[PDB]
Design an enzyme around this catalytic site. Sequence first.
Site, PDB file in Angstrom:
ATOM      1  N   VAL A  91     -50.680  14.795  -5.015  1.00  0.00           N
ATOM      2  CA  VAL A  91     -51.359  16.017  -4.598  1.00  0.00           C
ATOM      3  C   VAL A  91     -50.434  16.777  -3.651  1.00  0.00           C
ATOM      4  O   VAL A  91     -50.137  16.313  -2.548  1.00  0.00           O
ATOM      5  CB  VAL A  91     -52.707  15.711  -3.934  1.00  0.00           C
ATOM      6  CG1 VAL A  91     -53.336  16.979  -3.372  1.00  0.00           C
ATOM      7  CG2 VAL A  91     -53.646  15.049  -4.926  1.00  0.00           C
ATOM      8  N   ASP A  92     -49.977  17.948  -4.086  1.00  0.00           N
ATOM      9  CA  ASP A  92     -49.143  18.797  -3.255  1.00  0.00           C
ATOM     10  C   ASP A  92     -49.974  19.405  -2.129  1.00  0.00           C
ATOM     11  O   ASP A  92     -51.206  19.420  -2.193  1.00  0.00           O
ATOM     12  CB  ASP A  92     -48.513  19.903  -4.096  1.00  0.00           C
ATOM     13  CG  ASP A  92     -47.517  19.372  -5.105  1.00  0.00           C
ATOM     14  OD1 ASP A  92     -46.793  18.408  -4.778  1.00  0.00           O
ATOM     15  OD2 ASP A  92     -47.461  19.912  -6.229  1.00  0.00           O
TER      16      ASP A  92
END
Lengths: 120, 73, 118, 168, 300, 98, 125, 230, 78
Positions: free
Chosen positions: F53-54
């Site tokens: 997850v950026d």
Amino acid sequence: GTSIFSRQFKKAFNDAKYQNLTAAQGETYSHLGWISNVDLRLGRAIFTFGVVGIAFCIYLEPSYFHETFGHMSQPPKYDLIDSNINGVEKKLNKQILHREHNEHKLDGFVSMFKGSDVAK
Amino acid sequence: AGRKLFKHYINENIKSNNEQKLFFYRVNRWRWNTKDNTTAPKFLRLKYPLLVTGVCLFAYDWTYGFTQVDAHH
Amino acid sequence: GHGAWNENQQHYKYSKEEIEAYQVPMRIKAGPCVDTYIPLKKCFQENPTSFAAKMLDGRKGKCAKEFKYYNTCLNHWQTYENNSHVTNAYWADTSKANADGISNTYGGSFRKGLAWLN
Amino acid sequence: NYYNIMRQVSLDSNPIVLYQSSTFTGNGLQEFYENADALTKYLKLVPFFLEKNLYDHPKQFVIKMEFHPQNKVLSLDCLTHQGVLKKTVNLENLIPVPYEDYVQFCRRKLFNAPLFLDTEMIYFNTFQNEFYVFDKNAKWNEEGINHPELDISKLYNEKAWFDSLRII
Amino acid sequence: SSGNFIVLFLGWELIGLTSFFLINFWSTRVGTLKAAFKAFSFNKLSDLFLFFAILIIFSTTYNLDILSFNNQIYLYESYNIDMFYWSINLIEIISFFFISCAFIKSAQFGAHIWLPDSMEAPVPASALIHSATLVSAGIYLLLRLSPLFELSKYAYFILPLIGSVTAFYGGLVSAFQSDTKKTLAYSTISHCGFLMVSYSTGVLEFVILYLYVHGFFKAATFLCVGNVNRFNRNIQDFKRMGGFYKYLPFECLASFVCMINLSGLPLTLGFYIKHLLFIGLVESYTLYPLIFSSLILGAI
Amino acid sequence: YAPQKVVLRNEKSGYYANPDDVARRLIRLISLHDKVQNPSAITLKSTWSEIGVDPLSYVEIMLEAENEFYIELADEDLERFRTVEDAVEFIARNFFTN
Amino acid sequence: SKAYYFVKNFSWAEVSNLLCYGTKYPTVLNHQQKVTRLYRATLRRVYAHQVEGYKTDFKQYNENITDIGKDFNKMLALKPESLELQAYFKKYEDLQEELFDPAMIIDESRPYAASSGRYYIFDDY
Amino acid sequence: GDIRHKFSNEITDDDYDYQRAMHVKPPKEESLFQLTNILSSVPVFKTRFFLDFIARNLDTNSAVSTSDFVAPPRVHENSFFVYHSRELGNVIRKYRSLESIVLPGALLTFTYPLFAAFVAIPSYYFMFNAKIYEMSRRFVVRMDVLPHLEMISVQRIGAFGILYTKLHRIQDLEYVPFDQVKEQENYLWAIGGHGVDNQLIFKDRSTGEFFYFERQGVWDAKGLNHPLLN
Amino acid sequence: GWDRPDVPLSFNPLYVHKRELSIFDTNMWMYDQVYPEYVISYNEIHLVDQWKGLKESFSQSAYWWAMMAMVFGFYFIN
Ligand SMILES: CCCCCCCCCCCCCCCCCC(=O)OC[C@H](COP(=O)([O-])OCC(O)COP(=O)([O-])OC[C@@H](COC(=O)CCCCCCCCCCCCCCCCC)OC(=O)CCCCCCCCCCCCCCCCC)OC(=O)CCCCCCCCCCCCCCCCC
Ligand SMILES: CCCCCCCCCCCCCCCCCC(=O)OC[C@H](COP(=O)([O-])OCC(O)COP(=O)([O-])OC[C@@H](COC(=O)CCCCCCCCCCCCCCCCC)OC(=O)CCCCCCCCCCCCCCCCC)OC(=O)CCCCCCCCCCCCCCCCC
Ligand SMILES: CCCCCCCCCCCCCCCCCC(=O)OC[C@H](COP(=O)([O-])OCC[N+](C)(C)C)OC(=O)CCCCCCCCCCCCCCCCC
Ligand SMILES: CCCCCCCCCCCCCCCCCC(=O)OC[C@H](COP(=O)([O-])OCC[N+](C)(C)C)OC(=O)CCCCCCCCCCCCCCCCC
Ligand SMILES: CCCCCCCCCCCCCCCCCC(=O)OC[C@H](COP(=O)([O-])OCC[N+](C)(C)C)OC(=O)CCCCCCCCCCCCCCCCC
Ligand SMILES: CCCCCCCCCCCCCCCCCC(=O)OC[C@H](COP(=O)([O-])OCC[N+](C)(C)C)OC(=O)CCCCCCCCCCCCCCCCC
Ligand SMILES: CCCCCCCCCCCCCCCCCC(=O)OC[C@H](COP(=O)([O-])OCC[N+](C)(C)C)OC(=O)CCCCCCCCCCCCCCCCC
Ligand SMILES: CCCCCCCCCCCCCCCCCC(=O)OC[C@H](COP(=O)([O-])OCC[N+](C)(C)C)OC(=O)CCCCCCCCCCCCCCCCC
Ligand SMILES: CCCCCCCCCCCCCCCCCC(=O)OC[C@H](COP(=O)([O-])OCC[N+](C)(C)C)OC(=O)CCCCCCCCCCCCCCCCC
Ligand SMILES: CCCCCCCCCCCCCCCC(=O)OC[C@H](COP(=O)(O)O)OC(=O)CCCCCCCCCCCCCCC
């Protein structure tokens, strides 16, 4: 392995097109499968009452229709009393009645115009 | 002859559409369930209400309908 | 018979005490149809009926004889109050009305709407 | 933005039958009239045709479906109030739809459908914006439907199958 | 049902106080107290106006009986009152104070600011106050003291203009509104404006009919939206409401009937009230163009 | 009916919602995202960066989590969260009506 | 978030800062915090106006959020002291102001919201 | 999950059947008064007279499309088609055809044609012009390419449904981004631009005329790939 | 289903003062121990001040003036 036109896969897709993917399998459905029976019955009863009222308004109070669309052609309404007599008798009586109707319309008009001073 | 036209911009629009993320579609899929929503004309059925209306109007015609006066205008 | 639209069947004019007895609303007492109204009210009192029956009965049922006189008087009263018998004639034919002026007072200011250019 | 670009496909030599209605198995509306079951099913479908015409509901009762893997095209024989018609569909344009989606596509309350209208097996052509409805009393060719070209592993597209038709 | 101005003033203060309590029902929150205090301030202003008018009446005629005042005011119509530097007509000043208090309590333009904030009350209280209980006090005052206002130049000029302006304003704001209770409140403001204009026309029967129709159907619609809000977990904005027909079947149909009757629509019980209002509308006003245009916009 | 005797607040377990269900729903929501590749690798002790997850994808996932769980999460709390464990703990212990 | 925008006599600049970022003093925030908070605020407002709105169009919503996501990815890539990043921040702050809605829906789970403090909870004391 | 069976007095699907009018469920049984049952039962409809009437007097199968590939008749002996509109074109044609029946009929039937015109004028200027009429004026019914002229022939619907074709040079065609026109014509795109594609707008620079293409319109791969248009 | 813990004391959060209560703001704050509020709420804060509020109100109400003028003209010529 599976291919389209497979009944099992088609049923799975039909049930899963609008599923809730965040819910556990077997409970991932969004639709409501019924409608409140008592609420629907009462709502339909009151809706029917309102519809009947609107229709009675339409029927006995056509004033809105008259002032929004104009007076439409009236379905025929007459009595067959004149058919009792036949011949010259019928012709003369019909002419007399027609003359009386025209005279009555004129009499109503002139009476309305003249009677402006009746109330002192 | 190296001119941007219908094919070029159709490809551009296809690319723009493909660049979208399916995450939002996946989370919102439940909203447009056909099993759960309908239209107002479909829900408001006048079949039987109109039958009751006809019964009431027939009763009025045969009880008080006789005692009405024509109003021509 | 042959009475004017304001007179009733019996040609009887009710006094102030009689009006107070058969108390008439000021709305009707202001107009000229008190003589025709009082018999109708007396008939309704003698033969009370439900509001649904009053609405659904086009001849006022039992009180039809008095309602005929009352309705005629009401028509004349309202027509003379709003001057509709002259306004309708002007609407039907403004040109002819001006040619033989029914009422110059209304004719000089009457102007039918441009939308109603039949 | 999806655009209806046509590829000018053609039929192949030897098709593979996939669907065959047990009723209407004969050839011709005259044969349907002379057959007892076909006539009654046609009468029961008369409201179906009425919905097609007056309610502007694009749908077709499909019989005798064949498949051409060389060009990947389905040939459908459809029964209409006038007779049997032949139509061609590209696999790229065919997606499945729920029965409720088929019903809700039309904005008019459809007549009570007959009991031989297969609700599970309803498909949607996106190019034509049309529905295909099969008959419950029918025979499916298992070997034909198990063809490699018909596999979901090759014909599956999430965006097209799940997001193309949003009736709301 | 007050027999004299003292009982009328008592009832006036009592409705003000009890409406304050209903608005401030959520006593724990101070946000609710702000709306309650707004309503309280406006009610106290109306009480001041009513008290001053009653004092003027008592000074002129040594009587507080409503019937006696109604049957005596015509004699004193010709009188004037000597104020600071101007000789004001007695009827005009008395009617001015009465109309001011009536406007404040009926939520006319300018003095309506409290009504939108009064929706903090629970839906039953909101329905009761906005249907025929709190917002019709001014209409009752006008109807009860009509003989006074019939001889009032100020009433003649002010009732139609303010009524039509309030009707237009409330109607348009309600149309553009997104919250259910706020929409009903602004619709109530518009219908109160229409009631003022009907009284200006001067057919008390039409005013009473309009009052009855509005009160009944406004209350019913308020109850329906209350059920909707309770289902939606106190979220009154319909931007978060959708597809509730199946979840609240009765509410959908009841709301349909109640709304078609409330909003004057053809072939409904609520069409005749607006029809009679337009029948009775007077045309001798100087601001008739604005009055009529505002009335048409509010009606639509 | 409450007994006439004095009864005190009973904090049964800090969680106001089933933490297991909360964690499973949050993991499903995370897996729905495009950047997330292997749903199996996701555990409560897995950090957002390692699960994939950026920082920008995190805010999208958290907005959809708010929509799913019927609550609003403050930016301070969202920035304080460092693992799925912390996220599920906060969501489960949150009183949905504040 | 405390959802106290319309209370405590906030100026327009302070309210805009609260809406765009959780803080009233965005200068204290770092680059990543600023970008992420602004992206979250923009997505929240777009969802409020084009999903939970009046006759919302989901296709337009998807296109708009995709464009916003690309722009915010570029913003995050950009350096803090860049006029281009400043222009992006001004653009999206202007968008937030444009979409600002008085009486906007405030979730019941936030402080200072309607129904926030309707009940007084008694302590063990 | 369902526990209705545990109670003898609980509601049943037989009790819920009455909701099938307001609720969509797959058919379970046929009532005696259904259209299907009536038609299949009454022997009158089985008569060859009724069967032949059904077969003939209704929409024909000839007009029914038979393939996903369409090759409409060439406009010019040397031209080739590229784009064609299927449904929105017909809808616009039928809508504009009303001007040939409603309008003269309104003039000859309405008691107050001036009142009708006064009502229609503001109706046209708000919520109707931008809604349908401007979109129809800019709508492209069909597009072909003439290679010898290196031109494109565009067919359009005119007043009263009249169809007219016009030529535009390929060198004078440009792409107009939707951002440059959204603010100028927000209302048009707000209420009437849904049918046509927003991001595929073109215009003729010389004549300043726009071209709107239907979203549900058929394009030709060969026509798009022709070197003249690339 | 789940056995929820008793309603949180957190539902009412104690408010801690961090700023001097100026005597120049006496009774200008609706004092509270949980959720203190300003005596007046300004939801339409996008308008900086009342003067700009008046300007915006009149500029936007020009449209309603035009609507009224058109309606009155239509009724006047008809
Ligand atoms: C010798 C024999 C002679 C036979 C003559 C027959 C003449 C037939 C004339 C038909 C005329 C057209 C009727 C159209 C109806 C539908 C209209 C409609 O929906 O349009 C709006 C439609 C949108 O509406 P929608 O809701 O979306 O439509 C959904 C469906 O239509 C689905 O619609 P729905 O189901 O929701 O509702 C539709 C309904 C509409 O119906 C009504 O509204 C009528 C309501 C009843 C009125 C009754 C009046 C008279 C009686 C008054 C009361 C008397 C009381 C007596 C005392 C009682 C004491 C207890 O349709 C009907 O009219 C049904 C017929 C009525 C049957 C029941 C009548 C009462 C019987 C006695 C009582 C017992 C009742 C049953 C038991 C109840 C429980 C105990 O708009 C359109 O787009 C229309 C497009 C065109 C569609 C056309 C489809 C039909 C095409 C037919 C072509 C011609 C065929 C010719 C064949 C010839 C063979 C020989
Ligand atoms: C006996 C005879 C007596 C005659 C007496 C005549 C008295 C005349 C008094 C004139 C007073 C003018 C006052 C101007 C104040 C300006 C304030 C200012 O600087 O604001 C800046 C501000 C712009 O600054 P900003 O920062 O950009 O604003 C931000 C906004 O958000 C930005 O807003 P936005 O962009 O979103 O939308 C705003 C939009 C708002 O929308 C509109 O403005 C369009 C609708 C305007 C309707 C105007 C009223 C309609 C008539 C009502 C009449 C009622 C009384 C009479 C009743 C008679 C009944 C029988 O406005 C526009 O943007 C369009 C600009 C053009 C507007 C039209 C300008 C017309 C000027 C007058 C021309 C007269 C030519 C006569 C030729 C004669 C040849 C023989 O201005 C505006 O926003 C626009 C204000 C427009 C006011 C127009 C008022 C016109 C009144 C005409 C009355 C004619 C009476 C004729 C009687 C004849 C009897 C025989
Ligand atoms: C003492 C005098 C009493 C006078 C009573 C006067 C009643 C006036 C009613 C006016 C209309 C107001 C309706 C209010 C709601 C009730 C109606 C309603 O809900 O309709 C929806 C309902 C249903 O609405 P729906 O469309 O949602 O329901 C569909 C589902 N099914 C199929 C199950 C019904 O309408 C009907 O059921 C239609 C009824 C038509 C027939 C009407 C007459 C019935 C007569 C019964 C008695 C017969 C005695 C025979 C004796 C013989 C002796 C030998
Ligand atoms: C808790 C339950 C309590 C009991 C429930 C009782 C249910 C309701 C019973 C209502 C009975 C009365 C029905 C009247 C029907 C309308 C009559 C009419 O049009 O009046 C003409 C009468 C006859 O008048 P007229 O012909 O003497 O002169 C009229 C004068 N001009 C011409 C100038 C207009 O007209 C009026 O008095 C004015 C009526 C205006 C309002 C019209 C409303 C139309 C809608 C009616 C809805 C009815 C209720 C819903 C349906 C009920 C079905 C059973
Ligand atoms: C457990 C008991 C619970 C309570 C049950 C109460 C049932 C009430 C049922 C009727 C209510 C709705 C009536 C229709 C709506 C109003 C109509 C209207 O405006 O009036 C027009 C009409 C008026 O008459 P009209 O309109 O027909 O015209 C009269 C004609 N002239 C004028 C010539 C005389 O009124 C009614 O129809 C209403 C019914 C009559 C009034 C009844 C009052 C006495 C009630 C006795 C029962 C007491 C029960 C006590 C229970 C105590 C429990 C603790
Ligand atoms: C102050 C000044 C005020 C001025 C106000 C002016 C108001 C009057 C405006 C008049 C408009 C005239 C419109 C002409 C329409 C034709 C235009 C045209 O060329 O279109 C060709 C179009 C298109 O032609 P085409 O060549 O493209 O194709 C032929 C037709 N199709 C497409 C089907 C193949 O053709 C038609 O539409 C033919 C219409 C023929 C019928 C026209 C009259 C119908 C109404 C009759 C009267 C009303 C009913 C009476 C019923 C009586 C029953 C007993
Ligand atoms: C003279 C120049 C040309 C004028 C062209 C005519 C106007 C433009 C085309 C209008 C087509 C729509 C006609 C609908 C007729 C409906 C029945 C009717 O009332 O006709 C007689 C009436 C007029 O006939 P009349 O003049 O004998 O009526 C008596 C006069 N009144 C009604 C005022 C008391 O028709 C109209 O009033 C039409 C008004 C103009 C409508 C303009 C477009 C807006 C409506 C969009 C179309 C759909 C409307 C659907 C309405 C349904 C019912 C509410
Ligand atoms: C010029 C001729 C003389 C008359 C002058 C006046 C001209 C007409 C002025 C009409 C103003 C109507 C304002 C309605 C505002 C509704 C706001 C709302 O609720 O949201 C939008 C709601 C829809 O709400 P929604 O929730 O479904 O979606 C909203 C979507 N957004 C927010 C994106 C806009 O309703 C509408 O959209 C309809 C209003 C727009 C269309 C207006 C058409 C006017 C037609 C005039 C006909 C005139 C006939 C001739 C005679 C006239 C004089 C007698
Ligand atoms: C030349 C110009 C002269 C201008 C004179 C203007 C005088 C009147 C100014 C208005 C305020 C007057 C003081 C009362 C303040 C009440 C504050 C309050 O209760 O707050 C609640 C509310 C604040 O609540 P809120 O509306 O911000 O938020 C609460 C609602 N929720 C919960 C939804 C957020 O105060 C107001 O909104 C303002 C109330 C205005 C009405 C005041 C009624 C009394 C009027 C007395 C007039 C006295 C005139 C004396 C002579 C003057 C001579 C120049
Ligand atoms: C006083 C006029 C009263 C009304 C007259 C109505 C006439 C209707 C017949 C028009 C025939 C010519 C059309 C020309 C089209 C064109 O190319 O029009 C092109 C013209 C000129 O181009 P531009 O104005 O865009 O620059 O466009 C116009 O906008 C001006 C003409 C408008 C004509 C509108 C016709 C439709 C009216 C609809 C009324 C409301 C709906 C009614 C129910 C359906």
